[PDB]
Amino acid sequence: APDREKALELAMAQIDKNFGKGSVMRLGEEVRQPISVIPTGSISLDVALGIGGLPRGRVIEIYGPESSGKTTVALHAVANAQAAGGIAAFIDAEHALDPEYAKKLGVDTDSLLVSQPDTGEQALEIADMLVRSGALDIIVIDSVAALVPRAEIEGEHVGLQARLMSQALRKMTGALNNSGTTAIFINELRTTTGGKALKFYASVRLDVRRIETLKDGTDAVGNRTRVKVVKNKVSPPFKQAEFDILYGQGISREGSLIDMGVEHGFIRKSGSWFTYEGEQLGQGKENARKFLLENTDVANEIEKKIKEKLGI
Numbered sequence: 001a002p003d004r005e006k007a008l009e010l011a012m013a014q015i016d017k018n019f020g021k022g023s024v025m026r027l028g029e030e031v032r033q034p035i036s037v038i039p040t041g042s043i044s045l046d047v048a049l050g051i052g053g054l055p056r057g058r059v060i061e062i063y064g065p066e067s068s069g070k071t072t073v074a075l076h077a078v079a080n081a082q083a084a085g086g087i088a089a090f091i092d093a094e095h096a097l098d099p100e101y102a103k104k105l106g107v108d109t110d111s112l113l114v115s116q117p118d119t120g121e122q123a124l125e126i127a128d129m130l131v132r133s134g135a136l137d138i139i140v141i142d143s144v145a146a147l148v149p150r151a152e153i154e155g156e157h158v159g160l161q162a163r164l165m166s167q168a169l170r171k172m173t174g175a176l177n178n179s180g181t182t183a184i185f186i187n188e189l190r191t192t193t194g195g196k197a198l199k200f201y202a203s204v205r206l207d208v209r210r211i212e213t214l215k216d217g218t219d220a221v222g223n224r225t226r227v228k229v230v231k232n233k234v235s236p237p238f239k240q241a242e243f244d245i246l247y248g249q250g251i252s253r254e255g256s257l258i259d260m261g262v263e264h265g266f267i268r269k270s271g272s273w274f275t276y277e278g279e280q281l282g283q284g285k286e287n288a289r290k291f292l293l294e295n296t297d298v299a300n301e302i303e304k305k306i307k308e309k310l311g312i
């Protein structure tokens with residue numbers, strides 16, 4: 001009587017129904033859930049996420065060491081939501097945000113709501129309040145670690161900060177879903193106390209890390225970042241992405257067009273030279289990057305070709 005694949009589907013179907021779509025998936029499943037998303041600023045990362053970017057109405061955790069490119073991503077996400085006419089909020093407990101750098105990544109800072117809370121409790125209560133107004137497309141909490149309990153801030157023993165995150169996250173997920181607001185928790189590393197509850201509440205968790213220092217030989221242009229989607233409840237998890245961030249600049253589009261253009265074969269890399277349908281792009285990723293910077297026409301058709309092959 002037993003037919004495994006049949007019984008499996010019935011079980012999987014029941015699992016998703018009792019706990020929500022994506023509670024169980026095959027890693028090679030070709031997801032066809034066009035949920036609304038906020039492009040990550042990185043084409044490869046959006047692909048890695050399987051849905052085109054960060055899902056709307058969900059909790060996102062972006063962790064990693066400092067100088068990994070975490071906030072750059074958070075910032076491109078804000079910029080993209082704003083471009084789509086969305087409103088953005090920034091709960092700041094770090095006081096590190098460089099709005100001039102943000103404007104460079106396309107963020108409309110003048111319209112950016114910023115809040116510099118007195119305590120972790122207040123910081124999350126302010127975020128909850130903004131969220132359940134339903135007016136926001138996205139909200140970024142700078143530093144899970146900086147969300148220190150009031151009691152600690154006023155000189156008091158216990159494990160309070162984690163319960164703080166658990167309780168706040170419990171109340172907030174409901175609002176996020178109804179409002180459709182995406183919440184990005186930036187988690188500078190060294191679990192950061194509240195990172196514990198975040199691990200379970202998140203629909204997406206990004207392991208961000210610095211892996212290289214861009215050269216072009218003998219000086220530095222910027223650094224390369226690698227992101228792994230360790231958790232993904234909307235599309236198969238564990239996929240990875242890489243991209244370049246040049247000093248003072250954000251995520252290099254041209255850089256991403258070159259990388260993906262190579263793996264997906266539209267761009268041919270014969271040794272140290274890059275070529276695109278006949279014409280040469282240059283010797284060394286940088287010259288090619290510079291090339292795509294000037295010959296905007298090319299870049300767009302490549303982007304076009306890469307986009308068509310996987311989804312504009």
Ligand SMILES: Nc1ncnc2c1ncn2[C@H]1C[C@H](O)[C@@H](COP(=O)(O)OP(=O)(O)OP(=O)(O)O)O1
Nearest residue numbers: 065066067068069070071072098101223245247248
């Ligand atoms: N103000 C800036 N000017 C020029 N480059 C910057 C600036 N801020 C960040 N960068 C670049 C350097 C890194 O490759 C990428 C990492 O910084 P960022 O995205 O803020 O990472 P991060 O969030 O993991 O570390 P941090 O906690 O220092 O912000 O951004």
Ligand SMILES: [Cl-]
Nearest residue numbers: 039041042043
């Ligand atoms: Cl993007």
Ligand SMILES: [Cl-]
Nearest residue numbers: 117118119153
């Ligand atoms: Cl205070």
